[PDB]
Ligand SMILES: CC[C@H]1OC(=O)[C@H](C)[C@@H](O[C@H]2C[C@@](C)(OC)[C@@H](O)[C@H](C)O2)[C@H](C)[C@@H](O[C@@H]2O[C@H](C)C[C@H](N(C)C)[C@H]2O)[C@](C)(O)C[C@@H](C)C(=O)[C@H](C)[C@@H](O)[C@]1(C)O
């Protein structure tokens with residue numbers, strides 16, 4: 146694989162320090178290779194795991210084009226090389242806030258989970274408010290999923306019905322979901338460009354736990370911004386959720402009075418996502434997580 150990497154890089158006019166090549170296999174869509182070029186700059190090489198690379202990454206690249214065009218408070222991958230055989234970009238500054246350990250079923254944290262630095266929330270709030278305000282509507286030909294506020298609500302309604310039809314859903318959980326769907330005042334009246342897979346493994350931080358970059362824009366779309374807040378709630382609890390909401394609101398992010406409550410209900414719909422992923426991915430672990438999560 147190392148020899149293959151060097152050759153693939155060479156074909157794309159990328160020349161590496163062989164001794165620096167390291168593999169990261171945590172991605173389900175790409176093998177990721179870290180390597181320095183001959184000027185000592187750190188690169189990430191995305192080697193696709195499945196065919197039809199161009200069609201399958203078109204959406205992500207459109208989102209990255211928007212972020213690279215508009216955003217200044219955080220870095221996002223800037224694909225200098227982009228072919229069916231290789232995506233390569235300069236590695237973002239900083240390190241992941243945490244990485245998922247699948248055996249343990251939780252994070253290996255770079256930050257102190259018992260004393261989370263308040264700068265993490267302040268900086269993530271800035272990042273998300275900037276991201277969610279990007280004017281995606283100004284693009285001439287976007288292939289991203291784009292929802293109005295009403296469409297985002299109907300999307301959830303439909304996704305829930307589809308999960309119910311295939312997996313079934315416990316009566317009380319279903320009723321909670323429906324109460325959320327039916328409560329007008331809880332739903333946001335603005336949507337935005339989201340990252341869609343915001344979590345510690347994708348949030349790059351500096352030594353002070355400032356979020357300085359976001360990787361992996363596979364799930365980018367224009368919809369309810371709430372999905373980008375779920376990680377804070379699940380990792381840090383209500384306090385971390387409140388801190389992020391506060392920072393986001395105060396820097397000018399779209400805020401509505403029931404935003405926290407809405408995000409908590411979205412968190413209660415976590416099983417929808419697990420069930421969907423089980424279906425598309427065929428990964429046994431997600432199938433069993435889905436069965437237990439749906440009750
Ligand atoms: C707290 C600690 C837990 O972290 C979370 O709850 C975060 C906050 C989830 O994101 C939350 C929040 C959010 C928005 O994703 C960031 C949401 O979509 C998912 C379902 O749950 C993560 C990351 C999920 O991943 C995402 O699952 C998607 C179905 C696909 C997505 N990706 C490959 C396309 C992928 O990253 C998912 C399912 O939990 C991963 C599996 C492996 C786990 O069950 C692990 C062990 C988690 O319980 C966790 C680490 O312990």
Ligand SMILES: Nc1nc2c(ncn2[C@@H]2O[C@H](COP(=O)(O)OP(=O)(O)O)[C@@H](O)[C@H]2O)c(=O)[nH]1
Pocket residue numbers: 169171172173174175176177189191235236237239240241346360361362363
């Ligand atoms: N530290 C760091 N890790 C990265 C970077 N880019 C990718 N990775 C790692 O490589 C993994 C796979 O790349 P990613 O684009 O997420 O691929 P996917 O998960 O298959 O869609 C990521 O989840 C990270 O763990 C980067 O700029 N910095």
Ligand SMILES: [Ca+2]
Pocket residue numbers: 171172173361
């Ligand atoms: Ca990833």
